[PDB]
Design a protein around this ligand. Structure first.
Ligand SMILES: Nc1ncnc2c1ncn2[C@@H]1O[C@H](COP(=O)(O)OP(=O)(O)OP(O)(O)=S)[C@@H](O)[C@H]1O
Ligand SMILES: Nc1ncnc2c1ncn2[C@@H]1O[C@H](COP(=O)(O)OP(=O)(O)OP(O)(O)=S)[C@@H](O)[C@H]1O
Ligand SMILES: [Mg+2]
Ligand SMILES: [Mg+2]
Lengths: 187, 528, 187, 528
């Protein structure tokens, strides 16, 4: 009965709900407010899942990207000065690319990053940006904005779309007479 | 009778009576014995896995799991032995119905223990190692022992690179120092204390907990055959434990060293009167932060002798260690050989799973084979007053949380009951007030509760939180006997929730039991 | 006359002023306000220098670290949600370590990161964190806070302290009679 | 007379008269000639670096810098040549007093040009290469030429990996297509247009600018010997330029391709009437984004023939190129050999420095050896009205700025005067109003001004901004003649400030001149 795969979410309804919150566009002043609110909550939720353990790399990367984008567009003395936002983007991006490439690799000695990248179907632009971002002088804000958004959509067509449709009286030993065996979690 | 070769050797007349085996051997004879069995020598001298037994000694229960190096029994001249069957082992055996991993770990026969001969008595689709003591190891042990007998209470600091034999060697040291009985016209068995500073794969403790243990009888059993010990004659008792909620201390060095200090302090106090050596085994790092930790540990503890089980180790770590070791005025540092499957992860998991099934009370400790789901949880209240509520609150280590997330985040994981000794612990935290939401104790800093002021009272598994309409409460299950639980007034009791590596085995366990003996299980996704 | 080293600041007074703004502590509600204000301006200034070209790696890393720290401590609906800040830190840190190690390296084939790290005098903790941060599951907020602050002080004792003490009438061709040859920039 | 071997060969009677050299050679004779010299054949046929000269041809000024491959002059039978001295070259020569790099770049003798013989006529501490045409290259050129003559206006797309010979080959193609004069009973010299899409190390343009050039005479001179051309017979004129403010287009592919379209459009228009081939040379990438750009370029331009100068290139790039090339219905793709110091950086810098010293008016263009500091800047006003102010504002590409920073940030760097043709350019930007602060034109997006609506009018170097008390103004210096500058009303003129790689040479230049001929210089730190 090896058909046991552990996930950190409670069930499929929780997983789908989060997906909805991240991408209101496909799933579908006050309107913008509500959207921002939901996105914040979604990010928080994903963070919790990460702590719990055993969370798909794609979900993590998605969370990161949305976090950066959300931070960037924030009026009200919270625009992070400029250099911060550029860092947030670079971090999320580098992690995302490194993850994908490392995962789909062979167990030979030293096969090249570009080869693997092409084989999986990842645009060479992303790989190039990754190499540049880490070593050769942190990218400009505009380039990061574009790359981030493209990355998000690509992720959607790679992972998330395959997850469904698109619509001392303080301690009292529990009474050994009115108890019924229920699984762990449910009340 | 019973002839074979290459692994064991011939015995002689083996008289089976009432379920036990009386075997006579009139020459040096060595034989392996897989299973669960009690030894009670009648005449002569037998050496079993490090401990020498003679006529005037109580029965010793030995568990020999097919996973590790099966203990070998060597008898020195014309002796008669009586091998008894183990009772409590049957309870442990039944645990195989709740997780297939415990299935292939014992004698695949009928009785509790089956003698092993040449090559064909082995179980199917599984190899069968054997404990063998290198000449160096044995000689070194002899040297330490003779020095010890003409000195006070030595402290042996054992360390070295991963999978080298640190644990095994420690086992030997403990058993031999305890049981030795040289020229004194034997004696009695001199007690021995063990300090386990290995959160990763502990001993005499569940994973994720550091602890100090006091041993009276020999330790002839793996870690997953005695994780919890009767808190507070009795064989093995536990002095003090601390919850370092991780499986790799490299998340908060300060707390780790602090814990080390507190435990060693207590050791100092008790050791001072009745002379008792202390054997401490470290996690096992060589590069990075770990090496630094090892250095600091050597500095704080100031061990009498340091044993590095590598002899071909990296020059950087050996050098660094030698510098630190040399620094504390003088400290003998000697290197010893080593020797080159079940990964640490699975072993750790087994330890944890075993712990929760421990029954709430030669024998050592019974096991209750009924699944966790079927048990009756403890119903703790949450809206009371700060003195008649039960749990004082919930603290979090290395990671905070927003209010809404907390209920879903905590539920399901493993936590630890932490008893506050002196009020000087929660000084600085905004302790909740009587007043519906979980009494989360905000801790912006991140650092854990000071070790000098709080102690662990055994891990706790949450199985359900229902805080609605008018009665906030938690349903939690623990192995801790009711006696201790009731005697704490509720005010002095905080709940710590950290990492611990989510008890994945727990959820599935119910399903396995139901299927083997012969539905919207949260977190577990069935592949249909 | 090879004694010509190009810098992006105007002169030593500008360079020292920036240093002062970054570390008010050693150089020395309303007080906190003023300090935050100055730090923001300092970060902006450094960014400009980076664009101009030819700027020491240490200054860049310093700017990044201060930017992240500054963003983290911001009440007023600008606390960036949590996951953002953790990314900003990871980025700044990874860049800083990668820079130092890559610079002080030999022109042999494949000498190890740890060896170089030890030789330069960089605590092995930082290197370990770097490796973990990039690949093995983005670090917790607390660890990042501590590491960042330590990094800053270390940088101060490595670089910044060695920089001084511690106390169509729109186009009119300029009159060829009242002109005096001055260098580029000065008026 | 004048005998030697291995590099040149004997001449015959060399009659020196009035400063020129009349040399007769009655056999195939090849000789190198370093320096600056004008050729004017009297009888016969001479082949010089790709162009065939005969009696009925005007004097051709040739600059042969000791840096690149010195042109070789081969004469085909009994001919008489007159080598004239170059005048304007003297002005260029004096530039060595403002930067030592231009010092070691010519004949280290007395006159303007010195013939070279066996090995010892070479200057000290410097090697001396030589242009040699491989048989393959020459044969291929012959094939293209014969095909061209019996077809209309072909488009040759030259590309390949770095340092392979793309530029050199292009030079050959241009010179031969232009001057060839096969069996038609010679002709006249058929014009040729060149499209330079290499921001990195351009030709007929300063660095950081893409441009379309129209050539009448042969191009026998490196890039740093004619960067700017008389905007708007005359030898070399410039049709249109665009400011891609970088030295690596991989900062905004969209703009780059857009520029390519606009320029090619104009080419299409003018080419349509008078048949004229177009030679385009690309930057030279193989991996990453660059390869994609090359693909798109091939798609948009639709060249008649593609030449890949590698023959041993990486399989990935060759394959990719072949796919793209094949896609546009049919496109002949042929590979050619190559062959394996002054790095691109320094060469680029030299180009830029040369540009600003160009005198405001095969000969070509004079050079003014007076340092930039000593010159008189242009005083542009900044607080006027949106029609009588001078510069409409300052835009920034790929990076924004706060108000305070801008004044210090802009000052010192290189920018570009951009003329607005149609008002449809600044549509979307919050254009400043008359009203003291610099009229910064906010551009949140980041993207540059559309190419279809704006053009570049030559780079500008800022030497000082003083916006205080009541008279905001800028002091800037450019090579652009006053005539064009005045004729633009001021309203249709925006200033673009991007990257360009800071003109480090500018600041130091004043100091060098003062010292060689024989104080708080901003940005330059003297090592004392
Ligand atoms: N001389 C030996 N005889 C028998 N088994 C041995 C011997 N030396 C090593 N082993 C085996 O080595 C394995 C590792 O034993 P340990 O003592 O746990 O080493 P370790 O380094 O403590 O492992 P970790 O990483 O600390 S959990 C065991 O399964 C033993 O069976
Ligand atoms: N057959 C040749 N004869 C003489 N010089 C040659 C020959 N082939 C290559 N070279 C040299 O090759 C060098 C590079 O010439 P280019 O034509 O600029 O190559 P390139 O690939 O265009 O360089 P970049 O990267 O594009 S600037 C020049 O300095 C030439 O002197
Ligand atoms: Mg071990
Ligand atoms: Mg070239």
């Amino acid at each position: 009965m090896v058909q046991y795969i552990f996930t950190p979410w409670r069930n499929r309804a929780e997983l789908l709900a989060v997906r909805a919150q991240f991408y209101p566009e496909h799933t579908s002043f006050q309107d913008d407010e509500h959207i921002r609110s939901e996105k914040q909550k979604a990010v928080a939720r994903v963070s919790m899942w990460m702590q719990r353990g055993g969370c798909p790399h794609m979900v993590e990367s998605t969370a990161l990207l949305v976090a950066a984008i959300l931070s960037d567009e924030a009026q009200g003395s919270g625009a992070a000065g400029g250099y911060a936002v550029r860092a947030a983007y670079s971090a999320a991006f580098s992690r995302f690319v490194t993850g994908l490439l490392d995962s789909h690799q062979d167990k030979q000695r030293k096969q090249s990053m570009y080869d693997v990248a092409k084989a999986v179907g990842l645009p060479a632009a992303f790989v190039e940006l990754r190499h540049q971002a880490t070593h050769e002088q942190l990218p400009s804000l505009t380039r990061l904005r574009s790359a981030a958004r493209r990355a998000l959509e690509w992720i959607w067509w790679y992972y998330w779309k395959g997850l469904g449709p698109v619509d001392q009286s303080g301690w009292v030993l529990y009474d050994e007479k009115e108890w019924v065996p229920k699984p762990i979690g449910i009340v | 009778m019973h002839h074979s070769s290459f692994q064991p050797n011939n015995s002689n007349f083996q008289r089976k009576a009432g379920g036990r085996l009386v075997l006579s051997t009139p020459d040096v004879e060595r034989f392996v014995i897989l299973g669960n069995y009690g030894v009670k020598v009648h005449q002569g001298e037998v050496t079993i896995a490090g401990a020498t037994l003679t006529p005037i000694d109580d029965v010793q229960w030995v568990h020999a799991p097919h996973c590790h190096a099966l203990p070998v029994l060597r008898t020195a001249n014309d002796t008669v032995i009586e091998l008894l069957p183990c009772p409590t082992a049957q309870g442990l055996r039944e645990l195989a119905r709740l997780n297939p991993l415990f299935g292939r770990l014992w004698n695949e026969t009928s009785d509790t223990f089956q003698i092993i001969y040449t090559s064909a008595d082995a179980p199917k689709r599984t190899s069968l190692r054997e404990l063998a003591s290198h000449p160096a190891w044995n000689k070194k042990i002899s040297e330490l022992l003779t020095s010890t007998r003409r000195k006070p209470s030595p402290i042996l600091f054992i360390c070295g690179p991963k999978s080298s034999g640190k644990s095994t060697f420690g086992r030997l040291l403990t058993n031999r120092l305890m049981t030795d009985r040289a020229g004194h016209k034997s004696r009695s068995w001199k007690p021995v204390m063990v300090l386990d500073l290995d959160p990763g794969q502990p001993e005499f403790s569940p994973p994720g907990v550091v602890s100090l243990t006091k041993l009276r009888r020999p330790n002839l059993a793996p870690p997953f055959c005695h994780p919890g010990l009767s808190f507070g004659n009795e064989g093995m008792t536990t002095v003090r434990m601390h919850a370092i909620a991780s499986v790799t201390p490299a998340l908060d060095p300060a707390h780790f060293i602090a814990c080390a200090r507190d435990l060693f302090a207590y050791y100092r106090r008790s050791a001072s009167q009745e002379n008792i050596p202390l054997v401490v085994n470290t996690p096992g790092w060589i590069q990075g932060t770990g090496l630094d930790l090892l250095a600091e540990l050597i500095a704080v503890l100031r061990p009498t002798e340091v044993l590095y089980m590598s002899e071909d180790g990296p020059e950087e770590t050996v050098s660094a260690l030698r510098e630190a070791c040399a620094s504390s005025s003088t400290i003998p540092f000697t290197m010893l050989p080593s020797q080159p499957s079940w990964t640490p992860a699975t072993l750790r998991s087994m330890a944890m799973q075993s712990y929760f099934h421990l029954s709430p009370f030669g024998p050592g400790c019974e096991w209750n084979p009924t699944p966790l789901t079927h048990l009756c949880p403890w119903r703790v209240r949450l809206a009371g007053r700060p003195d008649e509520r039960g749990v004082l609150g919930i603290v979090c280590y290395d990671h905070q949380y927003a209010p809404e997330l907390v209920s879903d985040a905590i539920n399901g994981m493993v936590m630890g009951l932490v008893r506050i000794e002196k009020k000087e612990a929660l000084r600085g935290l905004a302790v909740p007030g009587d007043t519906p939401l979980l009494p989360l104790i905000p801790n912006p800093t991140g650092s854990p509760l000071s070790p000098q002021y709080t102690s662990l009272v055994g891990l706790v598994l949450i199985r359900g939180v229902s805080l609605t309409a008018s009665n906030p409460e938690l349903h939690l299950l623990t192995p801790v006997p009711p006696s201790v639980l009731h005697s704490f007034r509720g005010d002095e009791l905080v709940l710590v929730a950290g990492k611990f590596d989510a008890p994945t085995w727990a959820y599935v366990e119910g399903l396995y039991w139901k299927s083997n003996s012969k539905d919207e299980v949260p977190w577990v996704e069935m592949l249909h």
